[PDB]
Design a protein around this ligand. Structure first.
Ligand SMILES: Nc1ncnc2c1ncn2[C@@H]1O[C@H](COP(=O)(O)O)[C@@H](O)[C@H]1O
Ligand SMILES: N[C@@H](Cc1ccccc1)C(=O)O
Ligand SMILES: N[C@@H](Cc1ccccc1)C(=O)O
Lengths: 795, 242, 109, 159, 55
């Protein structure tokens, strides 16, 4: 939580910087993440009494007034924040002081009325949010000293985050004690004197389920003035720990809270029936809470109840009934301990997170109740009226949390830290933390204090020795280990390598949310059932992706809007595709994805300003996939994939099996909110192409080779990949090179047909090839070409 | 339009052919990775060397058959052309006191040109010195390296050998159908002479050092018949190592 | 040991930034470690940012998975990549790593 | 195996990788070569007339008797090697050190590491869509810009 | 990504190998076995996306 330096220094005061303290607590493992003065800065503001508050008026809502400090000659000031009463001891800025929002106290009449010199209010002094206005001190102030000195204003609230373990740092005491332990110092505790009852024997209080509330303290305190005005010092410790001073009773329970870690709560005896029963709630039993609304309570939820209705959730919250109201006369003080595993779930189940829930869920000291009861009794009758009553202590020997004996080996310690902390300095650090320790040759016996909920095993005990000795001064040594290599495989291909190649073909790497607009990715994949995220940061980010195609087209439009489309992005990461045959319900496959669109190159003097088409992507991935992997085996069969143009779109193969898709997105989907101009897109199943051919040197041949062009006529319904891939098979030993160098159609080629000029290069390792031998082996191809397909003349 | 504007998706896309590295570079790379993860820092030396660093500091010294045995190219009494990347072994050790740990790829030069010899070629020195290092580690680390290198296809041996700057020395010879046995790397424990003249106390530190022929590693692995093909740079040849 | 952890980490921070402090070898809590800690850099834009957590492995965890706490120890860390990055190159709003503006990206060429 | 400390090595982000530049070069369709460091002076002298070189007494041959002043003599010997064979269009690069006689260098020479390449023949070789044009200076210029520290700087580059 | 590679680089040198996990994971692995388990601030505190009662 938040605490006030000077209240801690009250409990323990090191001789060290304000700044040094903060640094020192943060190395204790609870990170200070805020430090604020409590007020703005100023001088020349002083306590003084108004001895006479003349009328006025002659200006209506204003009182002219003789005020008095110490350095005499009575000071004449004007005021009109309308609670400007006769004898008030008050905070006043004198003729020359300077207030925050740096403005200058001068001397001028106000309405012809006396001149100078403003009486102050909390707001005008940097401690924010107004009461009525005009600060009203508790009488008997130093009738002339600085309000900075009187109101202990050279003080910081200091805000910390406290890790769920070590729940002993949520009152001021625990924190004080931890800081004390650091500076070797002792912890100065306020004198908390038991009150001694003075009224009735009172109140039937049965615990129905003790294991969830071992210890319950109750104390009836009869006839107390509810609208008593919480005295400034308590308004000011409470406010400097981030608590709006609400009330009177409610404030004291808050004060004890912040002071001791203990969560008190008060009731209205005259609304509680036949005693209190501290019990588990019947399943669905409703309870209207301190804020309008009821709650359906599941049968594992402890409630502070009465003899025929429920009053308040167990160490969580209240009742739009059973609390302190306008005619409350008498109260019962709850100060209990609760088993944290009987608090854990519940508050958030209903969406509550109160001070009490919070301390109670990670563990309030089960040796604290009595002491907190006595501070909260003395503090109520001092501030409000009323008198005492017997502390009704209904405890439970057994289910009362049981501290455990830890044994801690000099070895284990040395073997886990790797640095020797002298025997003599570990015993102390342990005892000073709170333990009862018996040193015992190579080991220690430690008994865990009652207030520490995170000391259970040996290792928990070494956190502590390290913690306090100082991480700062545990030395760095590098780990000593064997140098074994681990198993490499030349045949596998790094994605790093592909990312580079990809981005040397001009491609920005991108990272996309793995969950996306479900609405949006239906237009991409038509109602293909997507794994459903019930309760996400957003409706538009609630589907686990099945492509990156969604993440990517989302990412073009993003920049498209920033005026500038010409985007070439790729991404790696997984798709999540529902499968009842997966481990769990989703196929989690690594993927490669990208999209290109707009001008092949940007504005250039000597490069054509053509936009980008299919073969620009095909070449880009023909680069990757391949001559990096293996190639010559892969193939681009044409295929419909709902969300890309059928005529201009292909499935990528690789000996037999789909490894991916590439296409220009389908039209209406481009128009589907998605933006300007034709866009190309591809995805590859990574793991299938994460592996390349390790080479083996193959002879060379010092004979010259021979080129032989062929003009292959063929129906428009025949791939051109296939014709080629068909020549280097009828290939053998050997036509070494096949190459498509032209595609011609129209005049002098049968309509609906098309010619592919093809050039086969023939080479041999044994002999320099014979004029006839050549024509022969082309003829073998040309003939196999009209095996399949047809053949083969002109263009 | 969606029919009428179909295209043949098997036509070859546009791109320039890819460009692999040369096979020895490819070998160098693999090795530097292998050793990268054992924490061996990569270190270079000039390829023009003197009578101190090639030879005399490595405890040759002058009247040793070595000078002649490495068919040395001299420029005069003094300047020579690296014979081994064993120079950096001396050069490194003189700049830093141990707990060293380094490779050292470079191109050394000899005077032979043959099916398995060239007037140039490349080597990988490794050095490691610290109060700790032994023969078992030399064997341990090299076995382990060969395993990854070849992946275990090839028939190796690990014999005794002789190097004036180690002792014990060792060679590993690998057989690859020919041939047959090829000298692949050579190694040992750093001769105490060589520790002394370089400023490290032999009584406190020990070290092992090694030097493997890259083109030989490269031949065997991808079975290149002829080491001399590595520098004729036929594109046909290079391109099969894309 | 721990010294191992603190050591390994220093080294890695001494390398990940090229000596732009401040740092914090500071204590923490993770139910899978004990003792555990956190680093937290500042490099201005204001307050300290957590950038990794770490600990010696909690003996529960080890046994939980078939490793004897009485014979092996270990350490583990969990680094936050983008806040590492954010700090490193001086990005402000970290949220702008997944908005993916081409102008933002381009300077990271 | 060896028992050692696992200390880190002292990396620096601001330094560029040759290995990275070769990838960029391969991605642009240059193939790596390694040529012999000692070239023929009768030819080096042709490319570097006058500026002359660290000759080598008792060499392997007279063609291989001069230490290269640059990567060009070995580079152009490779493109003729292949062009004789009879594969025109070659586009290669190599990294290696050259050897210029400098009196104020250690021993008499300044071994600098260079990066060098030739391209020639057509741009995009023999293709059904692409323009069969022969390579030109702006191709190389562009290749060099991408090598050029669009992998570091770039932008203080001047030609 | 630069930062990951960079880290892998630093860590590869010390020996560390690179493993991975599935991203959609279960109770057992994200928490339970990691010593959490079910009733421990962690769960809700970690600000967690659940698919159902263990996925
Ligand atoms: N061309 C070469 N390639 C690799 N190593 C060579 C070459 N020429 C000589 N050597 C060296 O020859 C030494 C012993 O091998 P050998 O020629 O089998 O007696 C090793 O140091 C090799 O590095
Ligand atoms: N060929 C290397 C062999 C070697 C290097 C380093 C150590 C041991 C042996 C040399 O003669 O230098
Ligand atoms: N998820 C943990 C990462 C961690 C791993 C190992 C030890 C400590 C922390 C975190 O939030 O920081």
């Amino acid at each position: 939580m938040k605490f006030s330096e000077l209240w801690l220094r009250e409990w323990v005061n090191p001789a060290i910087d304000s700044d040094a303290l903060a640094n020192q607590i943060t190395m204790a493992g609870l990170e200070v993440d805020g430090v604020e003065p409590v007020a703005g800065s100023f001088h020349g503001v002083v306590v003084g009494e108004v001895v006479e508050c003349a009328q006025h008026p002659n200006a209506d809502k204003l009182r002219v007034t003789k005020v008095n400090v110490g350095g005499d000659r009575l000071l004449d000031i004007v005021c009109g924040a309308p609670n400007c009463r006769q004898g008030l001891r008050v905070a006043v800025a004198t003729i020359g002081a300077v207030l925050p929002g740096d403005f200058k106290i001068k001397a001028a009449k106000l309405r012809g009325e006396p001149s100078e010199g403003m009486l102050c209010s909390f707001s005008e002094l940097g401690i924010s949010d107004d009461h009525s206005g005009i600060i009203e001190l508790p009488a008997d102030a130093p009738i002339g000293t600085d309000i900075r000195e009187y109101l202990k204003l050279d003080d910081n609230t200091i805000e910390i985050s406290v890790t769920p373990n070590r729940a002993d740092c949520l009152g001021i005491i625990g924190v004080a004690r931890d800081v004390a332990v650091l500076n070797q110092l002792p912890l100065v505790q306020p004198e908390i004197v038991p009150v001694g009852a003075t009224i009735d024997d009172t109140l039937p209080i049965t615990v129905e389920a003790p294991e969830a509330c071992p210890r319950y303290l109750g104390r009836v305190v009869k006839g107390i003035n509810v609208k008593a005005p919480t005295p400034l010092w308590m308004k000011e410790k409470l406010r400097r720990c981030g608590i709006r001073s609400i009330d009177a009773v409610v404030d004291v329970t808050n004060y004890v809270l912040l002071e001791l870690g203990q969560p008190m709560h008060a009731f209205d005896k005259d609304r509680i029936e036949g005693g209190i029963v501290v019990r588990m709630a019947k399943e669905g039993e409703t309870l209207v809470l301190l804020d309008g609304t009821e709650a359906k309570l599941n049968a594992d939820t402890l409630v502070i109840a009465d003899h025929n209705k429920a009053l308040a959730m167990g160490g969580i919250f209240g009742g739009e009934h059973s609390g302190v109201n306008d005619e409350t006369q008498n109260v019962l003080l709850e100060c209990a301990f609760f088993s944290p595993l009987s608090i854990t779930g519940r508050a958030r189940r209903h969406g509550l997170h109160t001070d009490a829930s919070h301390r109670y869920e990670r563990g309030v000291d089960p040796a604290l109740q009595h002491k907190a009861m006595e501070r909260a009794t003395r503090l109520l009758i001092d501030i409000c009226g009323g008198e005492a009553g017997p502390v009704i202590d209904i405890t439970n020997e057994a289910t009362l949390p049981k501290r455990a004996t830890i044994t801690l080996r000099r070895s284990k310690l040395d073997r886990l830290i790797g640095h020797h902390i002298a025997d003599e300095q570990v015993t102390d650090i342990l005892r000073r933390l709170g333990c009862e320790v018996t040193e015992g040759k190579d080991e220690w016996q430690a008994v865990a204090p009652s207030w520490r909920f995170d000391m259970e095993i040996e290792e928990d005990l070494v956190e502590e020795v390290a913690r306090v000795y100082g991480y700062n001064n545990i030395p760095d040594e590098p780990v000593q280990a064997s140098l074994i290599m681990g198993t490499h495989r030349e045949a596998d291909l790094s994605l790093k390598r592909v990312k580079t190649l990809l981005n040397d073909k001009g491609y920005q790497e991108v990272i996309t949310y793995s969950f996306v607009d479900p609405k949006v990715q239906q237009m991409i994949h038509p109602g293909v059932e997507a794994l459903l995220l019930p309760s996400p940061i957003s409706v538009e980010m609630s589907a686990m992706r099945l492509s990156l195609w969604t993440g990517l087209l989302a990412t073009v439009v993003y920049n498209q809007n920033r005026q500038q489309n010409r985007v070439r992005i790729f991404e790696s990461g997984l798709r999540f595709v529902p499968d009842t045959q997966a481990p769990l319900g989703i196929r989690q496959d690594l993927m490669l994805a990208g999209v290109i669109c707009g001008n092949r190159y940007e504005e250039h003097w000597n490069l054509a300003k053509e936009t980008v088409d299919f073969y620009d992507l095909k070449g880009d991935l023909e680069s990757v996939l391949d001559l990096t992997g293996k190639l010559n085996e892969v193939e681009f069969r044409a295929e419909a994939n709902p969300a890309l143009h059928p005529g201009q779109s292909a499935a990528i193969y690789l000996k037999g099996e789909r490894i991916g898709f590439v296409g220009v997105v389908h039209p209406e989907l481009e128009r589907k909110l998605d933006l300007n101009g034709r866009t190309l897109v591809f995805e590859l199943e990574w793991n299938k192409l994460a592996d390349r051919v390790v080479p083996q040197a193959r002879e060379i041949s010092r004979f010259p080779a021979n080129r032989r062009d062929i003009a292959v006529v063929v129906a428009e319904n025949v791939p051109a990949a296939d014709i080629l891939s068909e020549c280097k098979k009828v290939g053998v030993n050997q036509v070494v090179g096949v190459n498509l160098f032209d595609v011609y159609r129209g005049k002098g080629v049968a309509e609906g047909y098309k010619s592919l000029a093809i050039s086969l290069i023939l080479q041999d390792t044994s002999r320099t090839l014979e004029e006839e031998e050549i024509a022969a082996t082309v003829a073998k191809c040309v003939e196999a070409l009209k095996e399949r397909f047809q053949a083969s003349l002109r263009d | 339009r969606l029919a009428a504007e179909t295209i043949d998706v098997s036509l070859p896309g546009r791109r320039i052919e890819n460009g692999g590295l040369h096979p020895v570079t490819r070998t160098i790379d693999r090795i530097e990775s292998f050793f990268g993860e054992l924490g061996f820092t990569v270190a270079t030396g000039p390829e023009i060397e003197d009578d101190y660093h090639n030879f005399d500091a490595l405890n040759i010294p002058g009247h040793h058959p070595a000078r002649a045995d490495h068919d040395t190219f001299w420029f005069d009494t003094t300047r020579l052309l690296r014979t081994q990347t064993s120079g950096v072994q001396i050069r490194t050790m003189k700049a830093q006191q141990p707990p060293i740990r380094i490779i050292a790829p470079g191109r050394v030069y000899r005077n032979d040109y043959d099916q398995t010899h060239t007037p140039m070629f490349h080597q990988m020195e490794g050095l490691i010195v610290d109060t700790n290092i032994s023969f078992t580690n030399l064997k341990g680390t090299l076995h382990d390296f060969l395993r990854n290198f070849f992946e275990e296809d090839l028939q190796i041996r690990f014999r005794p050998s002789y190097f004036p700057f180690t002792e014990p020395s060792a060679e590993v010879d690998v057989m690859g159908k020919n041939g047959k046995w090829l000298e692949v790397l050579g190694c040992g424990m750093v001769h105490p002479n060589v520790l002394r003249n370089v400023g490290i106390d032999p009584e406190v530190y020990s070290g092992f050092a090694f030097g493997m022929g890259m083109e030989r590693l490269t031949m065997l692995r991808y079975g290149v018949t002829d080491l001399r093909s590595f520098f004729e740079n036929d594109l046909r040849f290079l391109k099969q190592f894309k």
